[PDB]
Amino acid sequence: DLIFCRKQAGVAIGRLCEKCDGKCVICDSYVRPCTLVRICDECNYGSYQGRCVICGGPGVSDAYYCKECTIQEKDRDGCPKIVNLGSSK
Template sequence: MLRHSKQEQQMCRKLPGVDIGYVCQQHEGRCVICDLQFDEVLPTMREVRICSDCGFGREGDERCVMCNASKPTEVAYYCQYCVALEKDRDGCPRVLNQSRHQRIATVRTR
């Protein structure tokens, strides 16, 4: 996701907590760091952990870590390559701001 417009997007990068990150249907099956498409979850992949500030408190109030859309469908994962390169230890991967193109795409899908 961030490989397309690294200058425009900022990630939280705080110390991750116990909250699990979720993604919407649009970002389902993609690594949150490198945007790699995967078909099935492998044992070498890791669930995304987000910080307590990005956790949104109550269960059922989760949002997509990539686009902040409500009602995410799947648990977010790091791909096996990002786990091998230890990019899963860089901090909370939640995107704090969106690029102009992402906002336009979100409006079109609604």
Template sequence: MSRHQYDLVQCMKQMGAQVGKVCGNCEGRCPICDSYVKPTVEVRICQECSQGHLRDRCILCGHRFTEEDSGVEAFYCLECVRLEKHREGCPRILNMGSSKSSMIMDKKKVGPGLERLTG
């Protein structure tokens, strides 16, 4: 979970055997602290997050994988493994946060192709 986005909610259920996948934009990021340094232990996700419509989505940003891009395995960084944060539960982000959702709603209010007036 991102250190600077406190409104994000993780699943935190008991981890299963399925390995978590991330998209190309999130590749190399630790799901707990967003560090790109020393990836060591692969991420395991719970049974519910590995089935259904969540199966083919990035565990961090929710981006849908295409047939060409099937996702990359996610890894915890060495520091989170040393602090045993990788044992807390499933790291999938369930909501996108209020700042991103308000941005999406603002785009829907303005409409496609129209510029937003600020002043």
């Protein structure tokens, strides 16, 4: 019901809301932000301009990835823009 879109990784900076704000996206964690989020404008467009990469609210900041997911190199897979397995709106 809730899983990744994993469409291709564009240049568009990620956008996170109030709620999600601290979280390294995949490791769920606040620890050690280092590097930066990219998603496809397909995932990120329009009403999604500055939209949460989780909940559907306006982005007030920019998710940083952990270092943990870094050395395991996951940040480079398909764009982590979570789709509810209904549509994305």
